[PDB]
Amino acid sequence: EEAKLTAHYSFDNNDLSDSTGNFGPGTITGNRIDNEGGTIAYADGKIGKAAVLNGQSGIRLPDGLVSSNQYSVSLWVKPEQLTTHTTTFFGAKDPNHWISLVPQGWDGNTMLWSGSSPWYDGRTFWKIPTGQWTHLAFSVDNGAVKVYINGVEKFSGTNFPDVFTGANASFALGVNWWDPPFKGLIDELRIYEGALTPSQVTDLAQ
Numbered sequence: 001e002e003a004k005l006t007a008h009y010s011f012d013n014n015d016l017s018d019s020t021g022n023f024g025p026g027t028i029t030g031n032r033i034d035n036e037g038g039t040i041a042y043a044d045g046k047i048g049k050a051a052v053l054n055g056q057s058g059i060r061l062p063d064g065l066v067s068s069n070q071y072s073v074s075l076w077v078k079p080e081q082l083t084t085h086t087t088t089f090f091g092a093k094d095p096n097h098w099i100s101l102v103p104q105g106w107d108g109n110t111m112l113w114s115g116s117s118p119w120y121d122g123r124t125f126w127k128i129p130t131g132q133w134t135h136l137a138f139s140v141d142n143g144a145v146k147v148y149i150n151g152v153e154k155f156s157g158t159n160f161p162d163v164f165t166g167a168n169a170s171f172a173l174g175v176n177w178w179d180p181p182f183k184g185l186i187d188e189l190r191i192y193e194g195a196l197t198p199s200q201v202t203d204l205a206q
């Protein structure tokens with residue numbers, strides 16, 4: 001049972017639209033998820049045109065993008081800088097119940113982070129470079145969670161929080177409620193219902 005695709009934010013057309021047509025387009029935020037006045041440029045990315053994030057800007061995605069107990073997220077990033085706790089994909093029912101794919105987390109490594117009630121540490125023990133393209137993916141199947149870097153599985157575990165089942169949660173690229181906005185390039189955002197097979201993974205990564 002391969003994971004089913006639901007959303008593809010590719011930026012290929014120099015806009016924040018979902019190419020599958022399922023979801024409304026993304027918005028532009030200021031330096032947090034809940035504010036406005038940012039900027040988004042478009043530069044050559046991993047596939048076609050990628051989104052540029054200047055370190056004070058983000059993208060609001062539509063509420064309820066993920067709303068199940070079985071889901072996955074894939075994307076490419078090219079960091080111009082790294083800042084601790086700063087999100088890529090995020091992630092939140094409210095400020096106390098959130099998920100976050102973090103390039104440099106509290107242990108200084110890439111991690112899938114959830115908090116704060118409770119706290120989940122999805123530690124990869126792997127560190128991301130600036131000025132290079134890294135592929136990141138992760139799947140959630142009823143508490144069963146796995147994290148992939150460049151196609152390589154680095155974290156697995158269980159008892160992941162069901163943050164999204166029953167909630168109209170806020171989703172964003174590059175910003176949250178507390179930390180520096182991501183700076184650099186984000187490309188090819190894809191959302192899935194169901195947990196990506198290893199095969200789909202290695203495909204997406206290469």
Ligand SMILES: OC[C@@H]1O[C@@H](OC[C@@H]2O[C@@H](OC[C@@H]3O[C@@H](O)[C@H](O)[C@H]3O)[C@H](O)[C@H]2O)[C@H](O)[C@H]1O
Pocket residue numbers: 085095106115116119120121178179
């Ligand atoms: O709630 C949003 C996040 O809170 C802020 O916390 C500051 C840093 O987060 C903590 O990370 C360590 C966590 O606490 C441990 O119990 C658990 O193992 C870890 O997940 C550190 O205390 C602070 O450096 C962040 O700014 C924001 O992302």
Ligand SMILES: [Ca+2]
Pocket residue numbers: 010011012045047048049050187188
């Ligand atoms: Ca693209």
